[PDB]
Amino acid sequence: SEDFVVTDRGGIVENSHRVHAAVVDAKGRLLYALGNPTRMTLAASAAKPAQALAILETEGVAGYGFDDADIALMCASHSSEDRHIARTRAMLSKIKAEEADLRCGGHPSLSEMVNRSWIKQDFIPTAVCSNCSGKHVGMLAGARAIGAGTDGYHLPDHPMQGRVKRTVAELCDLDAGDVEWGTDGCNLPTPAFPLDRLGRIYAKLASAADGSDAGEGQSTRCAALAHIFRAMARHPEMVAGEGRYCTMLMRAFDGALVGKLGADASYAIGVRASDATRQLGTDGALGISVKIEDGNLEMLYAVVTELLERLGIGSPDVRSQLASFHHPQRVNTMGVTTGGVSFPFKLRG
Amino acid sequence: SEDFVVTDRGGIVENSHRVHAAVVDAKGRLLYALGNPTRMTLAASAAKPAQALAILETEGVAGYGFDDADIALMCASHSSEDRHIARTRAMLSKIKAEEADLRCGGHPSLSEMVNRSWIKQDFIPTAVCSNCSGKHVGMLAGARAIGAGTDGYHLPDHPMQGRVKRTVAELCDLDAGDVEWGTDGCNLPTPAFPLDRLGRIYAKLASAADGSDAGEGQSTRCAALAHIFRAMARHPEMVAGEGRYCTMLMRAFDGALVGKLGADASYAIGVRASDATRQLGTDGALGISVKIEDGNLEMLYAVVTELLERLGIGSPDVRSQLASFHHPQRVNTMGVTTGGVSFPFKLRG
Ligand SMILES: [Cl-]
Ligand SMILES: [Zn+2]
Ligand SMILES: [Zn+2]
């Protein structure tokens, strides 16, 4: 419960970061942990698969013809690359809406290279550039589909947000009062719930993919979760973008898991049943959720990759694709190596 | 002690950050604390007044004619504004050296607005653009002055770095073995020592300023320390830059204190004797040092400003110049305030 990632300069402690993590089976049962695995935690973008489920379950959304890449964008914190903006526009045309209907705002790109090119051309980002633009088009779609009208689709009193709030609690297996709600950077309601339940959501996504693959009679909701998993794993460049952790992670694993960033350094992974998960002592899929207490994103990616290695998820060759995140470079302005990152935590079973 | 600064979204905890702080008198005696006031801490740029002392105490350096603004740049983590680069080049001319003699490297500017101009211009920062460039020119100056040789002025075996190492330990009142050393981003040795001793350095700076102002006989060391304080207080724009915390802080206080940032969220302040310092229980100058365990810079400035309020240093009107740092904006992409910062820590005496 005193679990840290620690950075050093020449062996001298620089910063230390408290780690919380939960590893759960398909029913949410805790298998491993770091820190406080039930920490009440703001899920932010890590909750988007649950918001995508509310959208996909809305009567009439099926008629718009969203494809797997559209759903991946719904699930995205994308880098605002030109292909992300283009897909946002295509999805707006599917529901006969326009950029002015979006109630999210522009922000500097989550990708440094994209942001640099915007600065170079004095580009001012707008609503269609939001990292959450696919989720917002999906919410516009649901509001239009049930004839609720698009103005106010983002407000808590709107039936689309009523559907979101109910769906999040159901996937977490919590009562409505056990989920807290604030306002997100994209101006939508955003939930907070115990960290282990974020893992439970992703364990259910991977379990639904396994059940779909195995030809099981799934409920419609399990079918839709299977679809969300498949969409994310098939189009991981839409979920984030070039150079991004989530994209590189999901590409490396080639369908064996999905992974998603949450704001202020949280992360969730849904792992399909495998030799690794069976070795970990469960007979189904697995869920992983992580939170760095102070919010440092660089440390998040380092810790998640170390956790994948300790859990034996993937092969050493597969995870070596993430080496630049696992041990972030610590070189000074003259090319001299001056420091490092250590993982003194111990996963408890 | 469980001393934190905490951010929230709608009252839901987002991130928390552990706080360490030391408030010391002129002899180093601990008056108040947060967290662990003796935490072994890399001083990084907060050590620069001690490095400047070692420069100014190198025999012959007086002959180059560095003025107070030059000395303020030796003490700086500047924003690489054009005036900082220009002064660096002027200082190299004073010592008949060239940019190729520097052993620090360029880096993206510490100022977002400067770095935005650089991006629009495709400007590549070079050695004279380093936030440490003034310190490096001073070290070259001292190497030249004693006849050592400029090659290797930055290496631990060089007499300039031997002088730095001895000077840091003396100011801290530590044996050599109680100061650890690593290599800095600017490619110089950088010390680590207990956090309270950083406060001690700055108490001694402010105490020397008081002794000079009162006309007391001073040792060559105290006279040099008083000069460093005066240079920083008179030229705070050289120590950091427009819009930077250290510059706004020192301008607001108009000579009553000096302050300096260290990388990975450390800060140090030397306070001249005043009603505030007497009210705090000491009869001379005071030093303050702070470290955010996880290295978040926004949180550091919020904590330092909150600490000055709690210590009664300044007036509500002097401190209000720092209001944007004290309570950082938490506004989303649509202009809605979504949260805030809180200070659940308790000063202890
Ligand atoms: Cl470095
Ligand atoms: Zn969002
Ligand atoms: Zn430096």
XYZ file of C-alpha atoms and ligand atoms in Angstrom:
701
model
C 0.000 0.000 0.000
C 3.143 2.181 -0.116
C 3.742 1.592 -3.823
C 5.832 4.086 -5.816
C 7.554 4.730 -9.103
C 10.694 6.729 -8.348
C 12.908 8.821 -10.643
C 16.560 9.547 -9.950
C 19.375 11.749 -11.125
C 22.617 9.828 -10.676
C 21.018 7.518 -8.118
C 19.730 10.447 -6.045
C 15.940 10.435 -5.623
C 14.371 13.101 -7.803
C 10.576 12.661 -7.734
C 8.411 9.859 -6.433
C 4.888 8.996 -7.551
C 2.305 6.937 -5.658
C 0.725 4.132 -7.743
C -2.744 2.601 -7.372
C -3.698 -0.392 -9.487
C -6.410 -3.059 -9.666
C -6.313 -6.303 -11.663
C -9.740 -7.945 -11.773
C -11.364 -10.991 -13.332
C -14.419 -10.885 -15.600
C -16.780 -10.572 -12.605
C -14.699 -7.773 -11.067
C -13.104 -9.938 -8.371
C -9.780 -8.450 -7.246
C -6.808 -10.615 -8.200
C -3.829 -8.250 -7.760
C -3.328 -4.738 -6.533
C -0.987 -1.829 -5.904
C -1.795 1.046 -3.607
C -5.524 1.422 -2.933
C -7.333 -0.542 -5.667
C -10.758 0.881 -4.587
C -9.624 4.547 -4.687
C -12.530 6.728 -5.727
C -11.247 7.903 -9.104
C -12.352 10.244 -11.886
C -12.422 8.028 -14.930
C -12.462 10.847 -17.586
C -11.705 9.390 -21.063
C -11.198 5.898 -19.704
C -14.990 5.771 -19.348
C -15.594 6.356 -23.086
C -16.317 2.685 -23.946
C -19.197 2.885 -21.455
C -20.414 6.129 -23.030
C -20.063 4.490 -26.462
C -22.260 1.646 -25.163
C -24.979 4.111 -24.132
C -24.797 5.641 -27.623
C -24.897 2.305 -29.434
C -27.806 1.115 -27.342
C -29.919 4.180 -28.181
C -32.957 3.405 -30.343
C -32.343 4.376 -33.959
C -28.575 4.968 -33.809
C -28.075 1.759 -35.829
C -29.717 3.497 -38.805
C -26.882 6.044 -39.150
C -24.455 3.326 -40.236
C -21.488 4.000 -37.961
C -18.687 1.577 -38.817
C -15.946 0.095 -36.635
C -13.617 3.062 -37.170
C -16.423 5.485 -36.203
C -16.941 3.526 -32.968
C -13.173 3.602 -32.328
C -13.345 7.373 -32.643
C -16.287 7.442 -30.220
C -13.931 5.620 -27.821
C -10.963 7.935 -28.597
C -8.816 10.593 -26.923
C -7.370 11.295 -30.312
C -4.395 13.497 -31.296
C -6.500 15.760 -33.567
C -4.653 14.511 -36.654
C -6.177 15.382 -40.005
C -7.676 11.848 -40.263
C -9.360 12.319 -36.853
C -10.874 15.608 -37.954
C -11.924 14.012 -41.235
C -13.635 11.091 -39.492
C -15.395 13.487 -37.111
C -16.758 15.314 -40.154
C -17.827 12.089 -41.822
C -19.749 11.059 -38.699
C -21.452 14.453 -38.507
C -22.607 14.022 -42.109
C -24.023 10.593 -41.202
C -26.437 12.242 -38.716
C -26.978 15.344 -40.881
C -25.394 17.637 -38.248
C -22.724 20.332 -38.468
C -19.726 21.453 -36.419
C -21.816 24.229 -34.859
C -23.904 21.488 -33.120
C -20.915 20.250 -31.129
C -20.828 21.435 -27.529
C -17.166 20.492 -26.922
C -14.361 23.020 -27.374
C -10.961 23.108 -29.100
C -7.722 22.610 -27.159
C -3.987 22.195 -27.884
C -3.386 18.817 -29.485
C -2.505 15.868 -27.234
C 0.275 15.195 -29.796
C 3.281 17.494 -29.535
C 4.049 17.101 -33.251
C 0.495 18.043 -34.258
C 0.489 20.969 -31.837
C 3.796 22.220 -33.238
C 2.379 22.237 -36.781
C -0.704 24.134 -35.575
C 1.519 26.734 -33.837
C 3.570 27.022 -37.014
C 0.470 27.793 -39.094
C -1.312 29.887 -36.403
C -4.151 27.353 -36.428
C -6.777 27.890 -33.701
C -8.459 24.552 -32.836
C -12.241 24.383 -32.859
C -14.904 21.979 -31.634
C -14.335 19.434 -34.439
C -10.690 19.139 -33.275
C -11.587 18.044 -29.726
C -9.970 14.816 -28.583
C -13.565 13.941 -27.529
C -15.142 14.876 -30.883
C -16.182 11.281 -31.724
C -17.908 10.839 -28.371
C -19.730 14.169 -28.869
C -20.902 13.219 -32.366
C -22.128 9.921 -30.899
C -24.111 11.842 -28.246
C -25.531 14.161 -30.897
C -26.517 11.029 -32.813
C -28.346 9.480 -29.863
C -30.172 12.710 -29.066
C -31.353 13.074 -32.678
C -32.224 9.374 -32.934
C -34.837 9.497 -30.191
C -36.155 12.896 -31.251
C -34.863 14.650 -28.151
C -33.289 17.453 -30.130
C -29.629 18.292 -30.245
C -29.460 21.494 -28.221
C -28.441 20.537 -24.733
C -27.410 16.952 -25.550
C -24.497 17.482 -23.105
C -26.508 18.659 -20.143
C -27.159 16.321 -17.184
C -30.964 16.740 -17.509
C -30.915 15.556 -21.154
C -32.184 11.996 -21.849
C -28.856 11.127 -23.523
C -26.977 11.983 -20.332
C -29.633 10.132 -18.356
C -28.823 7.079 -20.493
C -25.066 7.590 -19.992
C -25.362 7.866 -16.223
C -27.463 4.701 -15.984
C -25.161 2.751 -18.327
C -21.977 3.666 -16.452
C -23.394 2.535 -13.118
C -24.727 -0.701 -14.624
C -21.391 -1.635 -16.175
C -19.657 -0.905 -12.826
C -22.356 -2.942 -10.971
C -22.904 0.041 -8.667
C -26.012 1.828 -7.438
C -26.584 5.271 -8.980
C -25.619 6.972 -5.705
C -22.241 5.196 -5.671
C -21.122 7.017 -8.863
C -20.117 10.677 -8.507
C -20.312 13.180 -11.378
C -18.372 16.308 -12.327
C -17.912 18.314 -15.539
C -15.216 17.248 -18.028
C -12.788 19.272 -20.123
C -15.096 18.580 -23.087
C -18.080 19.986 -21.062
C -19.885 16.639 -20.629
C -20.709 14.992 -17.294
C -17.804 12.798 -16.254
C -17.997 10.000 -13.675
C -15.922 8.994 -10.659
C -16.115 5.508 -9.120
C -13.778 3.079 -7.327
C -10.688 2.293 -9.398
C -11.303 -1.476 -9.426
C -14.628 -0.859 -11.197
C -12.758 0.830 -14.062
C -10.939 -2.496 -14.433
C -14.280 -4.309 -14.215
C -15.572 -2.353 -17.204
C -12.563 -3.382 -19.313
C -12.637 -6.987 -18.084
C -16.262 -7.058 -19.345
C -15.217 -5.645 -22.730
C -12.586 -8.363 -23.188
C -14.899 -11.061 -21.848
C -17.586 -10.016 -24.360
C -15.009 -10.286 -27.185
C -14.086 -13.803 -26.009
C -17.750 -14.808 -25.842
C -18.414 -13.392 -29.297
C -15.379 -15.235 -30.686
C -16.488 -18.497 -29.049
C -19.938 -18.322 -30.675
C -21.862 -17.921 -27.412
C -25.415 -16.654 -27.157
C -24.694 -13.137 -25.933
C -27.102 -10.552 -24.665
C -27.417 -7.563 -26.967
C -25.311 -5.602 -24.473
C -22.552 -8.196 -24.518
C -22.686 -8.158 -28.325
C -22.277 -4.377 -28.290
C -19.379 -4.586 -25.825
C -17.753 -7.194 -28.081
C -18.186 -4.723 -30.961
C -16.593 -1.870 -29.013
C -13.598 -4.056 -28.111
C -13.229 -5.180 -31.740
C -13.534 -1.605 -33.058
C -10.840 -0.297 -30.697
C -8.436 -3.146 -31.436
C -9.020 -2.939 -35.197
C -8.616 0.866 -35.408
C -6.211 1.795 -32.586
C -4.889 4.780 -34.567
C -8.367 6.308 -34.179
C -8.329 5.749 -30.404
C -5.234 7.931 -30.074
C -2.856 8.450 -32.979
C 0.675 8.185 -34.308
C 3.289 7.745 -31.591
C 0.637 7.550 -28.852
C 0.813 4.943 -26.102
C -2.692 3.497 -26.643
C -2.125 3.091 -30.376
C 1.326 1.506 -30.041
C 0.123 -0.735 -27.197
C -2.874 -2.068 -29.079
C -0.931 -2.526 -32.324
C 1.795 -4.462 -30.522
C -0.819 -6.852 -29.026
C -2.689 -7.357 -32.356
C -6.116 -7.917 -30.830
C -5.125 -9.543 -27.528
C -6.143 -6.485 -25.482
C -7.448 -2.943 -25.675
C -6.022 -0.038 -23.692
C -7.260 3.469 -23.037
C -5.926 6.649 -21.389
C -7.954 8.573 -18.792
C -7.168 12.153 -17.920
C -4.827 12.971 -14.995
C -2.832 9.775 -15.505
C -5.261 6.897 -15.274
C -5.266 3.883 -17.573
C -7.426 0.856 -18.274
C -6.723 -2.391 -20.137
C -9.083 -5.219 -21.114
C -7.184 -8.504 -21.684
C -8.701 -11.433 -23.601
C -8.297 -14.886 -22.040
C -4.847 -16.283 -22.854
C -2.011 -18.455 -21.556
C -0.916 -15.373 -19.544
C -4.296 -14.780 -17.876
C -4.649 -18.494 -17.066
C -1.186 -18.407 -15.467
C -2.429 -15.475 -13.358
C -5.080 -17.787 -11.937
C -8.326 -16.841 -13.714
C -10.258 -18.858 -16.314
C -11.651 -15.830 -18.194
C -10.696 -12.349 -19.304
C -8.925 -9.820 -17.100
C -9.170 -6.106 -16.390
C -6.379 -3.696 -15.339
C -6.809 -0.153 -14.022
C -4.077 2.219 -12.879
C -3.915 5.710 -11.424
C -0.844 7.793 -10.639
C -1.913 9.795 -7.589
C -0.239 13.078 -8.658
C -1.309 12.832 -12.322
C 2.054 12.431 -14.103
C 1.424 10.914 -17.526
C 5.013 9.919 -18.304
C 5.073 7.875 -15.099
C 1.693 6.293 -15.934
C 2.966 4.783 -19.184
C 6.149 3.552 -17.512
C 4.185 1.865 -14.725
C 1.589 0.311 -17.036
C 4.358 -1.228 -19.120
C 6.171 -2.538 -16.049
C 2.876 -4.011 -14.846
C 2.354 -5.810 -18.160
C 5.849 -7.332 -17.759
C 5.284 -8.483 -14.147
C 1.885 -9.941 -15.127
C 3.527 -11.788 -18.053
C 1.065 -10.259 -20.535
C 2.569 -10.403 -23.991
C 5.943 -11.712 -24.970
C 9.197 -9.842 -24.297
C 9.404 -9.166 -28.056
C 5.864 -7.710 -28.109
C 6.437 -5.406 -25.119
C 9.805 -4.224 -26.500
C 7.776 -2.073 -28.894
C 6.912 0.023 -25.786
C 10.481 0.281 -24.517
C 10.578 4.067 -24.954
C 7.644 4.417 -22.526
C 8.804 1.721 -20.100
C 12.157 3.426 -19.362
C 11.732 7.050 -20.476
C 14.895 8.684 -21.782
C 16.893 10.634 -19.144
C 19.541 12.453 -21.193
C 20.626 16.063 -20.675
C 21.025 18.898 -23.247
C 24.517 17.546 -24.097
C 23.514 13.927 -24.717
C 24.743 12.618 -21.347
C 22.605 10.040 -19.504
C 21.824 11.598 -16.160
C 19.068 9.589 -14.556
C 16.469 6.886 -14.599
C 13.147 5.436 -13.480
C 12.677 2.689 -10.899
C 9.751 0.511 -9.888
C 10.158 -0.359 -6.180
C 6.521 -1.453 -5.915
C 5.485 -5.103 -5.381
C 2.246 -6.423 -6.809
C 0.169 -8.054 -4.078
C -2.144 -10.966 -4.747
C 2.949 14.361 8.528
C 0.309 14.164 5.773
C 0.752 17.536 4.132
C -0.842 17.739 0.688
C -1.959 20.076 -2.020
C -5.033 18.642 -3.794
C -6.928 19.405 -7.004
C -10.604 18.636 -7.473
C -13.241 18.509 -10.215
C -16.600 19.509 -8.708
C -15.242 18.574 -5.281
C -14.141 15.106 -6.431
C -10.414 14.592 -5.776
C -8.415 14.577 -9.012
C -4.736 14.529 -8.017
C -2.910 14.961 -4.726
C 0.682 16.113 -4.223
C 2.820 15.661 -1.134
C 4.418 18.864 0.197
C 7.757 19.294 2.048
C 8.864 22.657 3.351
C 11.351 24.188 5.747
C 11.287 27.658 7.299
C 14.629 28.496 8.936
C 16.413 31.317 10.656
C 19.771 32.841 9.655
C 21.684 30.128 11.504
C 19.609 27.359 9.986
C 17.446 26.685 13.026
C 14.136 25.130 11.943
C 11.191 27.387 12.824
C 8.296 25.834 10.848
C 7.861 22.812 8.593
C 5.655 20.838 6.241
C 6.132 17.189 5.386
C 9.732 16.190 5.935
C 11.863 19.376 6.175
C 15.149 17.426 6.025
C 14.245 15.465 2.859
C 17.407 14.815 0.842
C 16.660 17.015 -2.167
C 18.318 17.835 -5.458
C 18.657 21.607 -5.391
C 19.103 21.994 -9.169
C 18.706 25.675 -10.194
C 17.894 26.785 -6.630
C 21.623 26.243 -5.892
C 22.593 28.937 -8.421
C 23.236 31.753 -5.855
C 25.786 29.430 -4.226
C 27.341 28.704 -7.615
C 27.405 32.456 -8.304
C 29.180 32.958 -4.965
C 31.867 30.492 -6.031
C 32.221 32.450 -9.301
C 32.426 35.855 -7.607
C 34.933 34.532 -5.051
C 37.247 33.304 -7.825
C 40.237 35.632 -7.799
C 40.422 37.765 -10.928
C 36.757 37.557 -11.898
C 36.243 41.128 -10.669
C 38.505 42.275 -13.500
C 35.986 41.308 -16.201
C 33.524 44.009 -15.194
C 30.349 41.955 -14.802
C 27.551 44.258 -13.675
C 24.555 43.488 -11.424
C 22.343 42.424 -14.347
C 25.112 40.014 -15.428
C 25.248 38.570 -11.907
C 21.468 38.273 -11.894
C 21.821 36.207 -15.084
C 24.385 33.946 -13.349
C 21.645 33.330 -10.759
C 18.972 32.725 -13.433
C 16.709 30.044 -14.932
C 15.824 32.507 -17.630
C 13.137 32.224 -20.304
C 15.627 32.637 -23.190
C 14.075 35.960 -24.170
C 16.133 37.933 -26.689
C 17.441 40.140 -23.883
C 18.726 37.031 -22.042
C 20.496 35.647 -25.105
C 21.947 39.064 -25.942
C 23.304 39.502 -22.395
C 24.847 36.012 -22.538
C 26.693 37.006 -25.713
C 27.778 40.308 -24.194
C 29.105 38.432 -21.135
C 31.110 36.061 -23.363
C 32.711 39.111 -24.955
C 33.702 40.448 -21.508
C 35.787 37.293 -20.949
C 37.007 36.966 -24.573
C 35.285 33.607 -25.021
C 32.927 32.314 -27.690
C 29.703 30.312 -27.844
C 31.705 27.188 -28.810
C 33.389 27.335 -25.386
C 30.096 26.684 -23.579
C 29.372 23.146 -22.403
C 25.608 23.545 -21.848
C 23.096 22.837 -24.583
C 19.968 24.545 -25.904
C 16.494 23.345 -24.953
C 12.884 24.402 -25.559
C 12.261 27.658 -23.754
C 10.957 27.697 -20.182
C 8.417 30.275 -21.433
C 5.504 28.968 -23.509
C 5.239 32.293 -25.352
C 8.942 32.377 -26.225
C 8.830 28.755 -27.319
C 5.810 29.582 -29.535
C 7.835 32.265 -31.372
C 10.686 29.763 -31.746
C 8.367 27.205 -33.334
C 6.919 29.747 -35.769
C 10.452 30.745 -36.813
C 11.928 27.194 -36.912
C 14.519 28.505 -34.465
C 17.010 25.939 -33.145
C 18.228 26.828 -29.626
C 21.994 26.714 -29.111
C 24.241 26.920 -26.050
C 23.748 30.654 -25.363
C 19.979 29.994 -25.183
C 20.296 27.635 -22.166
C 18.370 28.825 -19.097
C 21.747 28.215 -17.335
C 23.823 30.227 -19.834
C 24.795 32.969 -17.393
C 26.037 30.455 -14.827
C 28.061 28.747 -17.555
C 29.646 32.016 -18.705
C 30.514 32.748 -15.058
C 32.177 29.317 -14.696
C 34.178 29.933 -17.880
C 35.166 33.317 -16.462
C 36.471 31.769 -13.269
C 38.331 29.062 -15.194
C 40.011 31.769 -17.289
C 40.819 33.848 -14.216
C 42.806 31.210 -12.352
C 44.668 30.007 -15.436
C 43.073 26.565 -15.295
C 41.966 26.165 -18.862
C 38.428 26.524 -20.223
C 38.356 22.999 -21.580
C 36.500 20.904 -19.048
C 35.395 23.811 -16.820
C 32.122 21.876 -16.238
C 33.784 18.587 -15.084
C 34.007 17.587 -11.401
C 37.826 17.363 -11.582
C 38.139 21.004 -12.698
C 39.128 23.583 -10.013
C 35.995 25.642 -10.724
C 33.837 22.667 -9.793
C 36.059 21.903 -6.787
C 35.381 25.474 -5.681
C 31.642 25.053 -6.287
C 31.577 21.813 -4.272
C 33.388 23.336 -1.293
C 31.274 26.524 -1.396
C 27.959 24.618 -1.422
C 28.974 22.512 1.574
C 30.179 25.587 3.477
C 26.956 27.530 2.938
C 24.951 24.449 3.997
C 27.261 23.981 7.030
C 27.623 20.355 5.919
C 30.618 18.039 5.666
C 31.471 17.171 2.050
C 30.152 13.635 2.409
C 26.691 14.916 3.391
C 26.219 16.596 -0.027
C 25.557 14.242 -2.977
C 26.211 15.197 -6.601
C 24.678 14.278 -9.926
C 24.837 15.832 -13.409
C 22.333 18.607 -14.296
C 20.361 19.237 -17.493
C 22.920 21.960 -18.325
C 25.793 19.417 -17.964
C 27.283 20.769 -14.673
C 27.542 18.939 -11.337
C 24.416 19.583 -9.304
C 24.107 19.045 -5.522
C 21.572 17.324 -3.287
C 21.369 18.087 0.437
C 18.638 18.142 3.121
C 15.825 20.474 2.191
C 16.220 22.680 5.261
C 19.796 23.517 4.183
C 18.472 25.057 0.969
C 16.458 27.381 3.204
C 19.671 28.005 5.163
C 21.493 29.225 2.040
C 18.754 31.721 1.327
C 18.503 32.878 4.963
C 22.244 33.614 4.738
C 21.707 35.562 1.474
C 19.045 37.752 3.038
C 21.017 38.134 6.272
C 24.035 39.401 4.307
C 21.760 41.899 2.539
C 20.611 43.157 5.945
C 24.202 43.507 7.177
C 25.322 45.435 4.090
C 22.317 47.781 4.282
C 22.996 48.504 7.959
C 26.657 49.322 7.214
C 28.148 46.472 9.275
C 31.703 45.261 8.739
C 31.460 42.130 6.594
C 33.734 39.335 5.501
C 34.502 39.065 1.819
C 31.960 36.192 1.697
C 29.084 38.087 3.318
C 29.783 41.070 1.095
C 29.560 38.871 -2.002
C 26.317 37.301 -0.719
C 24.819 40.772 -0.165
C 25.784 41.657 -3.732
C 24.098 38.516 -5.125
C 20.905 39.340 -3.212
C 20.977 42.935 -4.508
C 21.568 41.827 -8.112
C 18.659 39.357 -8.051
C 16.284 41.835 -6.373
C 17.281 44.678 -8.720
C 17.162 42.607 -11.912
C 14.448 39.980 -11.327
C 13.642 39.958 -15.040
C 17.096 38.450 -15.587
C 16.497 35.679 -13.013
C 13.491 34.371 -14.971
C 11.507 36.549 -17.396
C 8.216 38.204 -18.230
C 5.275 36.409 -16.695
C 7.552 34.067 -14.690
C 6.853 33.349 -11.018
C 10.294 34.380 -9.739
C 10.234 37.710 -11.591
C 6.662 38.585 -10.529
C 7.384 37.513 -6.958
C 10.535 39.605 -6.657
C 8.957 42.649 -8.341
C 5.924 42.470 -6.025
C 8.201 42.466 -2.950
C 10.443 45.295 -4.225
C 13.592 44.221 -2.371
C 12.064 42.509 0.699
C 13.024 39.027 -0.512
C 14.571 37.004 -3.295
C 13.160 33.804 -4.718
C 14.384 31.158 -7.097
C 12.950 28.082 -8.836
C 14.694 24.700 -8.928
C 13.752 22.035 -11.430
C 11.376 19.218 -10.377
C 9.330 21.635 -8.320
C 11.652 22.994 -5.660
C 11.675 26.614 -4.562
C 13.755 28.812 -2.249
C 13.173 32.247 -0.746
C 15.459 34.510 1.320
C 13.507 37.057 3.405
C 15.147 40.181 4.866
C 14.376 40.925 8.517
C 10.953 42.561 8.926
C 7.868 42.790 11.123
C 6.766 39.531 9.503
C 9.989 37.715 10.392
C 9.943 39.048 13.967
C 6.284 37.985 14.280
C 7.418 34.498 13.209
C 9.834 34.355 16.163
C 13.288 35.283 14.837
C 15.408 38.412 15.196
C 17.149 38.254 11.809
C 16.518 37.080 8.264
C 14.547 34.013 7.243
C 14.810 31.309 4.605
C 12.080 29.178 3.034
C 12.485 26.048 0.949
C 9.790 23.891 -0.636
C 9.619 20.641 -2.613
C 6.610 18.984 -4.256
C 7.421 15.260 -3.992
C 6.156 14.392 -7.479
C 7.622 17.430 -9.241
C 4.512 19.327 -10.404
C 5.470 22.975 -11.099
C 1.952 24.421 -11.121
C 1.364 22.958 -7.660
C 4.696 24.306 -6.446
C 3.797 27.916 -7.239
C 0.348 27.480 -5.625
C 1.956 26.094 -2.458
C 4.716 28.728 -2.263
C 2.160 31.506 -2.568
C -0.101 29.883 0.007
C 2.892 29.508 2.327
C 3.751 33.202 2.062
C 0.162 34.050 3.026
C 0.224 31.685 6.005
C 3.593 33.117 7.184
C 2.202 36.669 6.847
C 5.030 37.654 4.502
C 3.983 40.650 2.483
C 0.528 42.162 2.476
C -2.644 40.959 0.759
C -1.973 43.608 -1.863
C 1.650 42.620 -2.519
C 0.700 38.937 -2.669
C -2.318 39.551 -4.952
C 0.109 40.101 -7.878
C 0.552 36.309 -7.665
C -3.173 35.421 -7.527
C -3.063 33.523 -10.836
C -0.426 31.195 -9.365
C -2.009 30.905 -5.922
C -5.355 29.568 -7.198
C -4.725 28.229 -10.713
C -7.486 28.525 -13.312
C -9.539 25.337 -13.732
C -11.602 26.222 -16.819
C -12.647 23.754 -19.515
C -12.672 24.113 -23.339
C -16.063 25.875 -23.218
C -15.102 28.432 -20.525
C -16.781 26.629 -17.601
C -14.956 26.460 -14.251
C -14.814 22.782 -13.347
C -12.728 22.619 -10.187
C -10.028 24.124 -8.039
C -6.986 23.696 -5.797
C -6.979 23.153 -2.023
C -4.235 23.173 0.614
C -4.858 20.421 3.241
C -1.547 20.852 4.966
C -0.822 22.247 8.413
C 2.232 24.296 9.308
C 3.963 22.950 12.387
C 6.309 24.872 14.648
Cl 19.160 16.051 -17.448
Zn -14.656 14.108 -23.080
Zn 22.217 24.541 -14.738
